[PDB]
Design a protein around this motif. Structure first.
Motif, PDB file in Angstrom:
ATOM      1  N   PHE A  84       0.838  -1.189   0.000  1.00  0.00           N
ATOM      2  CA  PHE A  84       0.000   0.000   0.000  1.00  0.00           C
ATOM      3  C   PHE A  84       0.875   1.241   0.000  1.00  0.00           C
ATOM      4  N   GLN A  85       0.440   2.262  -0.725  1.00  0.00           N
ATOM      5  CA  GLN A  85       1.120   3.547  -0.772  1.00  0.00           C
ATOM      6  C   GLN A  85       0.241   4.586  -0.095  1.00  0.00           C
ATOM      7  N   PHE A  86       0.800   5.287   0.885  1.00  0.00           N
ATOM      8  CA  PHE A  86       0.146   6.421   1.517  1.00  0.00           C
ATOM      9  C   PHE A  86       0.905   7.681   1.136  1.00  0.00           C
ATOM     10  N   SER A  87       0.191   8.657   0.590  1.00  0.00           N
ATOM     11  CA  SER A  87       0.802   9.806  -0.058  1.00  0.00           C
ATOM     12  C   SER A  87       0.400  11.093   0.642  1.00  0.00           C
ATOM     13  N   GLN A  88       1.370  11.988   0.794  1.00  0.00           N
ATOM     14  CA  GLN A  88       1.147  13.342   1.278  1.00  0.00           C
ATOM     15  C   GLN A  88       1.902  14.332   0.402  1.00  0.00           C
ATOM     16  N   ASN A  89       1.993  14.030  -0.896  1.00  0.00           N
ATOM     17  CA  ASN A  89       2.813  14.831  -1.800  1.00  0.00           C
ATOM     18  C   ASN A  89       2.139  16.152  -2.145  1.00  0.00           C
ATOM     19  N   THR A  90       0.811  16.165  -2.216  1.00  0.00           N
ATOM     20  CA  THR A  90       0.097  17.381  -2.578  1.00  0.00           C
ATOM     21  C   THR A  90       0.359  18.476  -1.556  1.00  0.00           C
ATOM     22  N   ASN A  91       0.442  19.718  -2.040  1.00  0.00           N
ATOM     23  CA  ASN A  91       0.671  20.843  -1.141  1.00  0.00           C
ATOM     24  C   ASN A  91      -0.466  20.994  -0.143  1.00  0.00           C
ATOM     25  N   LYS A  92      -1.708  20.793  -0.586  1.00  0.00           N
ATOM     26  CA  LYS A  92      -2.825  20.886   0.347  1.00  0.00           C
ATOM     27  C   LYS A  92      -2.717  19.825   1.435  1.00  0.00           C
ATOM     28  N   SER A  93      -2.286  18.615   1.073  1.00  0.00           N
ATOM     29  CA  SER A  93      -2.067  17.590   2.086  1.00  0.00           C
ATOM     30  C   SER A  93      -0.999  18.022   3.081  1.00  0.00           C
ATOM     31  N   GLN A  94       0.093  18.609   2.590  1.00  0.00           N
ATOM     32  CA  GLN A  94       1.190  18.981   3.477  1.00  0.00           C
ATOM     33  C   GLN A  94       0.774  20.068   4.459  1.00  0.00           C
ATOM     34  N   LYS A  95       0.057  21.090   3.985  1.00  0.00           N
ATOM     35  CA  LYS A  95      -0.373  22.152   4.889  1.00  0.00           C
ATOM     36  C   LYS A  95      -1.298  21.607   5.969  1.00  0.00           C
ATOM     37  N   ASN A  96      -2.176  20.676   5.608  1.00  0.00           N
ATOM     38  CA  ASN A  96      -3.082  20.065   6.566  1.00  0.00           C
ATOM     39  C   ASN A  96      -2.463  18.879   7.294  1.00  0.00           C
ATOM     40  N   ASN A  97      -1.352  18.339   6.798  1.00  0.00           N
ATOM     41  CA  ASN A  97      -0.696  17.191   7.420  1.00  0.00           C
ATOM     42  C   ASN A  97      -1.615  15.972   7.427  1.00  0.00           C
ATOM     43  N   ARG A  98      -2.243  15.700   6.286  1.00  0.00           N
ATOM     44  CA  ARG A  98      -3.194  14.605   6.136  1.00  0.00           C
ATOM     45  C   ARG A  98      -2.684  13.642   5.073  1.00  0.00           C
ATOM     46  N   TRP A  99      -2.607  12.363   5.422  1.00  0.00           N
ATOM     47  CA  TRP A  99      -2.149  11.338   4.501  1.00  0.00           C
ATOM     48  C   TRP A  99      -3.331  10.749   3.740  1.00  0.00           C
ATOM     49  N   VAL A 100      -3.043  10.222   2.553  1.00  0.00           N
ATOM     50  CA  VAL A 100      -4.059   9.710   1.644  1.00  0.00           C
ATOM     51  C   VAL A 100      -3.660   8.315   1.189  1.00  0.00           C
ATOM     52  N   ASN A 101      -4.600   7.375   1.274  1.00  0.00           N
ATOM     53  CA  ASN A 101      -4.374   5.996   0.842  1.00  0.00           C
ATOM     54  C   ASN A 101      -4.448   5.964  -0.681  1.00  0.00           C
ATOM     55  N   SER A 102      -3.330   6.324  -1.311  1.00  0.00           N
ATOM     56  CA  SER A 102      -3.340   6.581  -2.747  1.00  0.00           C
ATOM     57  C   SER A 102      -3.612   5.314  -3.547  1.00  0.00           C
ATOM     58  N   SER A 103      -2.875   4.241  -3.275  1.00  0.00           N
ATOM     59  CA  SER A 103      -2.934   3.074  -4.143  1.00  0.00           C
ATOM     60  C   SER A 103      -2.351   1.862  -3.437  1.00  0.00           C
ATOM     61  N   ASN A 104      -2.548   0.699  -4.053  1.00  0.00           N
ATOM     62  CA  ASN A 104      -1.916  -0.538  -3.623  1.00  0.00           C
ATOM     63  C   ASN A 104      -1.657  -1.409  -4.842  1.00  0.00           C
ATOM     64  N   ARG A 105      -0.756  -2.378  -4.690  1.00  0.00           N
ATOM     65  CA  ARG A 105      -0.397  -3.277  -5.777  1.00  0.00           C
ATOM     66  C   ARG A 105      -0.136  -4.669  -5.229  1.00  0.00           C
ATOM     67  N   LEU A 106      -0.591  -5.680  -5.963  1.00  0.00           N
ATOM     68  CA  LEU A 106      -0.396  -7.083  -5.602  1.00  0.00           C
ATOM     69  C   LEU A 106       0.685  -7.647  -6.517  1.00  0.00           C
ATOM     70  N   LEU A 107       1.911  -7.736  -5.998  1.00  0.00           N
ATOM     71  CA  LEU A 107       3.061  -8.182  -6.771  1.00  0.00           C
ATOM     72  C   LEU A 107       3.682  -9.475  -6.270  1.00  0.00           C
ATOM     73  N   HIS A 108       3.402  -9.885  -5.039  1.00  0.00           N
ATOM     74  CA  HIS A 108       4.038 -11.039  -4.429  1.00  0.00           C
ATOM     75  C   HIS A 108       3.069 -12.209  -4.370  1.00  0.00           C
ATOM     76  N   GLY A 109       3.618 -13.417  -4.472  1.00  0.00           N
ATOM     77  CA  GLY A 109       2.831 -14.622  -4.303  1.00  0.00           C
ATOM     78  C   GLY A 109       2.677 -15.087  -2.874  1.00  0.00           C
ATOM     79  N   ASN A 110       3.405 -14.483  -1.939  1.00  0.00           N
ATOM     80  CA  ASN A 110       3.333 -14.857  -0.536  1.00  0.00           C
ATOM     81  C   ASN A 110       3.677 -13.633   0.304  1.00  0.00           C
ATOM     82  N   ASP A 111       3.964 -13.864   1.583  1.00  0.00           N
ATOM     83  CA  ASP A 111       4.159 -12.768   2.525  1.00  0.00           C
ATOM     84  C   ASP A 111       5.286 -11.849   2.078  1.00  0.00           C
ATOM     85  N   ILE A 112       5.207 -10.593   2.511  1.00  0.00           N
ATOM     86  CA  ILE A 112       6.262  -9.606   2.272  1.00  0.00           C
ATOM     87  C   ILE A 112       6.872  -9.313   3.639  1.00  0.00           C
ATOM     88  N   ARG A 113       8.001  -9.959   3.924  1.00  0.00           N
ATOM     89  CA  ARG A 113       8.600  -9.850   5.249  1.00  0.00           C
ATOM     90  C   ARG A 113       9.437  -8.585   5.390  1.00  0.00           C
TER      91      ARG A 113
END
Lengths: 50, 129, 67, 132, 56, 60, 70, 185, 51
Positions: B46-75
């Motif tokens: 999962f990627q959580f993003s605060q790159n936008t200037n409005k996000s930075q001024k408010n200090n709010r993170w956004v659940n931007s995206s996720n990707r399924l790349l592994h066949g098993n656990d990601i340790r």
RNA sequence: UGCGAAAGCAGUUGAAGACAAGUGCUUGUCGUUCGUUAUAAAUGGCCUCG
């Protein structure tokens, strides 16, 4: 049964246990065919009586 | 499966995201703390993003995206950036590395390294016998 | 003539066998009719089977490389 | 057996009209029909020719008493199906429709016969009981 | 049932009404016949696959 | 239970009531709902939009 | 020559016709023809005899994330 | 503007977003003022995997513009929604709809997103936590969604009832936002 | 809790909205409702399942 | 697509323009036109009030 045969034809060849599950099935489905043919025959003669 | 962002000075919770379906085993962030990457048992990054200037001024993170790349656990997950490098390296029970780009994680391409690259040989064959 | 679309003739024949009745039928001719009908049933079953048919890694392997 | 198979193989290569007569030869048996199909029908052109001859014959007289031609069709369909549909000839598809149309009648014809067979069987039994 | 019709066929003929009193029999026999067209279709596909691996 | 009057729209009056339940009731008293109306305009708040786990009761 | 997923052969008597996820390498590191990718992944490759090539290849529960199929 | 493929107007009625073939580009314009005037190709928004995949992924079926102009939601025939931050063209993917999304609408404050499509289910995406609330088993597929009120008291929906192929059977549904009950059908 | 059994006999307006819970669903019915097609088939063939 | 019963009986699936990719040539596409009765696949499944 039509789908699983059409969907697992290749797995059928490599699995022995599945094969016997059809051999008895073919004998049983054949037996039903005999009954249904038989039922048609009693159906035919019953029309003659009436 | 939750990712929580706490305020250090007050030791209070700012945000909570119920993102993963199972344990979140590893976390990482970029140089500027614009992105936070989480991975775990559910095989998703999962990627959580605060790159936008409005996000930075408010200090709010956004659940931007996720990707399924592994066949098993990601340790394990780690990140590196430089003027010539931008990597998000992950691996786990699948026994293989996956390489992404931090800045372009959502849309960028990824590479799955071979499980065994025999730089040191564990097999030999004898022509005689 | 029969013993010598066909259902519209046979279904008509089945009407004959009902009209004629049990008593009026004669054993000698009935045997010939029985031989005929059993002949058609075998064929009709055969064609039905045809119609349905129309509707319907190794651990070690030796291979030759092309070079 | 070997001679007729070689003759039939040659006629397929030669586009002979005698292909049909080779197929009705009484020397043919079921196991060698399987062997011929598996071993010698290796080209789609040969497979199409055999189907076209058999299907045309069966279409004309689906009630022919000779079980051999149907036996060829049954095992030809069973063993070589995956590529018979691969044949893209329009005439091959058309002849399939004709064959299906002829056989489709027969499937409708069967239930009537079974009823007629049943009513006779009672009549024979009753006559036998009356005799006894 | 088969023997009842055969043996007592003469008596059954001399009955004012049969279908009303033998309605259940006709319905029961009708249902079995309806299976025959589909059972053949299933049988052909079973034979097509059954023949396939047996030779292989 | 408590009265509520909208700070902007003075004509809006409303009563909120809650108990040891997973829902809250709101009673609109605006216009003639309080006295003249034969029936009461009642709404039930029962949706937390994904935050059910945090909340067990609306009582407080 | 062989790698993790490829095998190649080069004849050294014949000259060839002239006709992202890694460091850009702007900085320094310090301070007749056959190619096949059919066989992979490879543990080891070598010759048993003059005409025999020995290719050795590689032959756990996971969290279920279903793939919708309609 | 020329060759307008798709268009939308903010809830306030003061901003216009439109897609044109000048493949395609999205431009947002303030309508009573010159404060907002931006344009960018759709290629920048689209993910590379979409460029690899079929045309359904690259086909926009719905578009919504926030009142402030900071966010723009694009819905695709694949069922994937992408909220774009207009300041820096950052993308955010929201994926629940299995089939094409037909209606998108922002809340007045912009913190919630109404979405509807063939599922016959209206989804309120909570953008703060990316959560979602559902109203399923509606009478028909949702052609249009809107938040209608000074405080978002009501939701106005248009339903299609695609069962009847002979005619398009539209139905207007006004729901009470408090308890999601049909205030007027 | 001395007023739990009042039932509002003396009151001007009684408001009722309580809706009884639906009858308990079996495992196969729940799976179909949740779009678990494969698991629903499995629940079909389990020991002691009515034909 | 036409007719018809539900079975079936006959008949179609063409041309141009533009764009993309690969190497003037090849392939594929079209929120482009004219004419004829004429696989899918962005990890993405449906609320709460006992």
């Amino acid at each position: 049964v039509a789908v699983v045969l059409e969907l697992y034809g290749n797995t059928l060849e490599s699995s022995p246990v599945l094969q016997e599950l059809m051999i008895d099935l073919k004998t049983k489905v054949r037996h039903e065919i005999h009954k249904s043919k038989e039922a048609q025959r009693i159906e035919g003669m019953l029309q003659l009586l009436t | 499966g939750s990712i929580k962002f706490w305020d250090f000075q007050f030791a209070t919770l700012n945000q909570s995201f119920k993102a993963h379906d199972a344990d979140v085993l590893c976390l990482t962030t970029d140089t500027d703390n614009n992105y936070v990457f989480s991975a775990g048992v559910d095989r998703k990054i999962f990627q959580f993003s605060q790159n936008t200037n409005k996000s930075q001024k408010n200090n709010r993170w956004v659940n931007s995206s996720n990707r399924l790349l592994h066949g098993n656990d990601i340790r394990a997950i780690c990140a590196y950036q430089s003027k010539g490098a931008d990597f998000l390296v992950s691996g786990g029970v699948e026994k293989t590395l996956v390489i992404n780009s931090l800045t372009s994680f959502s849309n960028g391409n990824y590479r799955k390294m071979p499980t065994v690259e025999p730089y040191s040989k564990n097999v030999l064959v004898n022509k005689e016998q | 003539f029969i013993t010598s679309q066909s259902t519209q003739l046979f279904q008509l024949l089945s009407l004959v066998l009902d009209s004629i009745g049990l008593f009026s039928l004669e054993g000698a001719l009935l045997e010939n009719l029985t031989l005929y009908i059993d002949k058609q049933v075998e064929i009709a079953e055969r064609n039905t089977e045809l119609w349905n048919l129309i509707d319907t890694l190794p651990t070690y392997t030796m291979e030759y490389l092309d070079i | 057996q070997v001679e007729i198979a070689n003759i039939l193989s040659s006629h397929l290569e030669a586009n002979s009209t005698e292909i049909l007569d080779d197929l009705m030869s009484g020397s043919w048996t079921e196991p060698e029909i399987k062997k011929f199909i598996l071993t010698k029908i290796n080209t789609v052109d040969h497979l199409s020719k055999i189907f076209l001859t058999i299907s045309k014959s069966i279409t004309q007289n689906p009630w022919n008493e000779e079980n051999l031609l149907p036996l060829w069709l049954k095992w030809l369909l069973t063993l070589k199906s995956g590529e018979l549909n691969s044949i893209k000839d329009k005439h091959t598809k058309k002849n399939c429709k004709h064959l299906k149309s002829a056989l489709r009648s027969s499937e409708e014809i069967l239930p009537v016969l079974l009823g007629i067979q049943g009513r006779l069987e009672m009549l024979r039994r009753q006559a036998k009981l009356r005799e006894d | 049932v088969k023997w009842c019709l055969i043996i007592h066929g003469g008596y059954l003929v001399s009955i004012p009404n049969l279908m009303s009193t033998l309605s259940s029999l006709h319905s029961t026999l009708k249902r079995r016949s309806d299976l025959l067209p589909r059972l053949l279709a299933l049988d052909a596909r079973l034979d097509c696959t059954i023949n396939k691996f047996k030779t292989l | 239970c408590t009265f509520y009057t909208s700070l902007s729209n003075q004509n809006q009056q409303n009563i909120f009531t809650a108990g040891r339940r997973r829902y809250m009731h709101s009673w609109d008293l605006s216009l003639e709902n309080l006295t003249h109306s034969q029936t009461a305009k009642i709404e039930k708040f029962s949706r937390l939009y994904g935050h059910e786990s945090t909340q067990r009761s609306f009582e407080n | 020559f062989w790698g993790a997923t490829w095998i190649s052969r080069i004849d050294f008597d014949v000259d060839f016709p002239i006709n992202g996820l890694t460091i850009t390498d702007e900085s320094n590191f310090m301070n007749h023809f056959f190619f096949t990718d059919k066989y992979k992944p490879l543990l080891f490759v070598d010759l048993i005899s003059s005409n025999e090539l020995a290719i050795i290849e590689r032959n756990q529960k996971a969290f279920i994330q279903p793939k919708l199929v309609f | 503007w020329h060759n307008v493929i798709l268009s939308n107007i903010s809830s306030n009625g003061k901003l216009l977003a439109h897609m044109c073939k000048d493949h395609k580009s999205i431009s947002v314009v303030s309508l009573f003022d010159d404060s907002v005037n931006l344009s960018f190709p759709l290629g920048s928004i689209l993910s590379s995997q979409t460029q690899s995949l079929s045309y359904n992924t690259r086909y926009v079926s719905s578009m919504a513009i926030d009142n402030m102009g900071q966010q723009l939601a694009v819905g695709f025939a694949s069922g994937v929604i992408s909220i774009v931050s207009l300041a820096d063209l950052q993308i955010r993917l929201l994926k629940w709809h299995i089939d094409s999304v037909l209606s998108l609408s922002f809340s007045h404050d912009g913190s919630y997103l109404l979405s509807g499509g063939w599922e016959k289910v209206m989804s309120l995406w909570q953008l703060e936590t990316n959560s979602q609330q559902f109203l399923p088993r509606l009478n028909g597929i949702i052609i249009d969604c809107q938040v209608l009120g000074p405080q978002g008291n009501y939701y106005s929906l248009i339903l299609q009832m695609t069962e009847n192929n002979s005619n398009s059977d539209y139905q207007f549904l006004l729901l009470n936002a408090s308890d999601l009950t049909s205030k007027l059908s | 809790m001395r007023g739990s059994e009042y039932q509002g006999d003396q009151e001007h307006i009684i408001h009722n909205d309580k809706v009884r819970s639906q009858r308990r669903m079996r495992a196969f019915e729940r799976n179909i409702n949740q779009f678990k097609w494969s698991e629903a088939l499995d629940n079909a063939f389990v020991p002691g399942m009515a034909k």
